[PDB]
Design a protein around this nucleic acid. Structure first.
Lengths: 98, 91
DNA sequence: AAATTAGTTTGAATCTCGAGCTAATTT
DNA sequence: AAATTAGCTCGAGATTCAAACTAATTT
């Protein structure tokens, strides 16, 4: 009665295909594309922060959204994110959202 | 300027970059809409996994399997990297 | 009025880190 | 042969955690 939703189709993005149709592709694939494009524009420059870089690009929208969902309620936001309330306050401060 | 972007296409078949954070934002709005007040619980490990896997995968490809060079690029410890590689069964 | 949340501290537990070593692999 | 990397181990330092609490806010 319940069709399987694989982990990769839980967070998805609208895309356009070779027959000009709108389809949902995983968010992972967006991340793959951002990076292929990041790499292509390196031309041998040194990177030492790729993890923090990516992590930010993802924490900011996540906090942004969960805070809107909870209408500013930090205790609720922490409970649905699955992290300590203090940890959250730390992150909110890090991105100027407190 | 924004280093992490993706390609979008509009109705006039013109292509344009957009920040990766915008995709994430779309994805979450879509997730929240799809659940109607069902409780969300581990949203941080969820997203982090969706992002850490293709990150490891792309960097390992770029360094051709070299874990030591990979960790250096990412700015994390070689142990941490191995640990993450274990976590997602890429070993 | 009661209930919940914000803001804060304290210490325990978990993670991340560099460092250090040898065997295997690449150069 | 020399050089680098993989796979370990061991603390040390940093981070996340849950408890506590009271003031502030929302219900």
């Amino acid at each position: 009665m319940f069709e399987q939703r694989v982990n990769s189709d839980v967070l998805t993005v609208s895309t356009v295909n070779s027959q000009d149709q709108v389809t949902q592709k995983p968010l992972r694939d967006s991340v793959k594309q951002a990076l292929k494009n990041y790499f292509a524009q390196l031309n041998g420059q040194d990177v030492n922060d790729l993890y923090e870089l990516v992590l930010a690009e993802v924490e900011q929208p996540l906090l942004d959204m969960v805070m809107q969902y909870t209408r500013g309620n930090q205790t609720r936001a922490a409970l649905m994110m699955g992290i300590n309330r203090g940890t959250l306050r730390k992150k909110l401060k890090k991105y100027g959202m407190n």
